[PDB]
A and B are shown apart, each in its own frame.
Chain A
């Protein structure tokens, strides 16, 4: 079993249940940028907890960058408050975490070629294109990028226990190859 993963990113979606005039948000908030040619949302930011919000005209927003579930929820609530202050009748509704990313560093290098050869059905490896082995796991639906340095990053999770289970499942395989 051994060491535990450290979460690095959490993505949450929350519906404010009201239409927003994006340019009015951009012109009033210092911490907002709007470029309709590049992207259809205003990119707001706050410094506690450090997070970014893609707030769309339809009332949905995507809050990213948090390191914990409580931080993500609190940041989403703060963004809803900020939209409320600008005059819109935004209401915090429909919160749901939709991605968690983790990272871990087991203390030994990995023989990626042998791992790819043995577990070819569940992995892909093109070292000319990307220096990391890609591993897709069916039971917890987690995708792991495995690197020769002994560092693994897990993605696609919707709960912390999913990345924990994925690391527990993958650790014996990495032990076998050095």
Chain B
């Protein structure tokens, strides 16, 4: 057997990803050294595109792309639903003839391979030897139009979706969209007009994601072909279904930069629709709010959007940040983890804006809600993001004045000290916290019932202990920032906790003292807690 037979099998039987990456690199270098035998490699790598394994198909597509990248460029002149010469002409035809195969794996591989081939060699497609230059250019236009037409027909007929996770995934739609994005780089603007007319601005959206984001600099400010897409996206954002909302939000986020640059006028309507859609409390099981908040964070990150938002609060404060961003607070305790993480990340992006707007909504309300998040969270990632947001908020609030931090959180400090220094029970005999200590996002008093009740049997003791140490870190930091004369209630609370009849509360008090000592400017400040600890040991 030759080296190639053993080298191709690594793409399927490779023990690790680096081994398969090295296999494709070696195969590409092989084609480079022996340019006369592209078909030998292609005939052995192409059959993997219809393999059942996902990773094998992806690796085969990457191998085909890297093999083809080393061959010379070509220039011979001088409604049935989908459910579960040009040198590469026969390869592309074999991909297109099973692009409508019933099995979804074959379609996935066909789309990936067509993307990879056209990505490097789309310019020379469709031409035939012996024809004139201009007529061959017309033939290339015909070929690219045919490929775009067939791919768009595939997009409008495929309904295969995966519901394993909250965010539904359409593999064939995504691959076909990337294929359109590969195709549309080389065509002339007349074919771009034709494709924009074919994918009419109505609500496809995943198709729009790559019908724009290609030839981007020329589509910008191009009249209707850029004015209609914003209408289509805005209509999608206000639609009822969560799926179309999520897809539209994910389609606008990578294009947010040039859609912002397209007009200053469109920003008002866009941010209005985004905030209006986020204001309505979505359905409990929807992951779309995460995409909506990612879109909001990305849009607010650009300077001109900040200028537009500052301009918007002209006649009143209704559209200002201070009144609006509390609309994100209800989603802090949403059932789906992605929404909670998105809320925290968007709030961190807003906090790191500066520009004298952050002082508006930064107050004791958000601090207390984030402390409740720390206490009642079970997911590690959301807990980490919550503590990061807490640290950033406390640091920003102490940037203005330590007195502002000290008296803003003074209203809330004692109940949060009760929560942080709360005991932990045994499995069948919990020691529940008082629900009156927890605030609602839009209410004075309170999904998180198990953590509040202290049910160790239903939520593991590790989770409770981790919540306690996280609360200790947060409260130690906020003790450290605020001035010493204001710490009377804090210090007497921990001192009384150090003498409690409970075991868990003493541990929490020691943890709070340790974190306060760690975060201080110098260790000597916390010396008032010396002798109680020596009495403990």
Contact = CB atoms under 8 A, between A and B. Distances in A.
B428 interface: yes
Interface string A16-47: 00000000001111110000000000001111
Interface in B31-53: none
A44 B162 CA distance: 11
Interface string B159-196: 11111111010010000000000000000000000000
Contact of A28 (B160, B243, B428, B457): B160
Interface of A: 4, 26-31, 44-48, 68, 70, 74, 77-78, 81-82, 85, 164
A45 B335 contact: no
List the 3 closest pairs (A to B, CB-CB), nearest first.
A30-B162, A27-B83, A4-B427
Contacts of A46: 163-165
Given A31-B162, A85-B168, 13 more contacts: A4-B457, A28-B83, A30-B161, A30-B164, A30-B171, A31-B164, A46-B163, A46-B164, A46-B165, A48-B165, A77-B284, A85-B163, A85-B243
Contacts of A70: 450
A27 B161 CA distance: 10
Interface residues of B, number: 22
B163 A82 contact: yes
Nearest to B457: A4
Interface of B: 83-84, 104, 159-166, 168, 171, 243, 284-285, 335, 427-428, 450, 457-458
A28 B158 CA distance: 9
A169 B345 CA distance: 50
A30 B285 contact: no
A104 to B, nearest CB: 12
Nearest to B450: A70
Contacts of A31: 162-164
A68 B458 contact: yes
A26 B84 contact: yes
Nearest to B159: A28
Contacts of A44: 163
Contacts of B427: 4
Contacts of A45: 164
A93 to B, nearest CB: 16
A162 B458 CA distance: 15
B457 to A, nearest CB: 6
A29 B161 contact: yes
Given A4-B428, A28-B159, A68-B458, A77 B168 contact: no
A29 B335 contact: no
A114 B231 CA distance: 80
B81 to A, nearest CB: 9
A61 B428 CA distance: 32
29 contacts: A4-B427, A4-B457, A26-B84, A27-B83, A27-B84, A28-B83, A28-B84, A28-B159, A28-B160, A29-B163, A30-B104, A30-B162, A30-B163, A30-B171, A31-B162, A31-B163, A45-B164, A46-B163, A48-B165, A48-B166, A68-B458, A70-B450, A74-B335, A77-B285, A78-B166, A78-B285, A81-B285, A85-B163, A85-B243
B25 to A, nearest CB: 32
Contacts of B160: 28, 30
Contacts of B171: 30
A26 B161 CA distance: 11
A165 B223 CA distance: 74
A30 B168 CA distance: 10
Given A28-B161, A47-B164, A48-B165, A164 B428 contact: yes
B484 to A, nearest CB: 45
Given A4-B428, A74-B335, A164-B428, A29 B285 contact: no
A47 B166 CA distance: 9
B173 to A, nearest CB: 13
Nearest to B337: A48
Contacts of B84: 26-28, 30
Contacts of B162: 29-31
A77 B336 CA distance: 13
Nearest to B84: A27
Contacts of B168: 85
Nearest to B104: A30
A71 to B, nearest CB: 10
A68 B450 CA distance: 11
Contacts of A77: 284-285
A30 B166 CA distance: 14
A68 B459 CA distance: 10
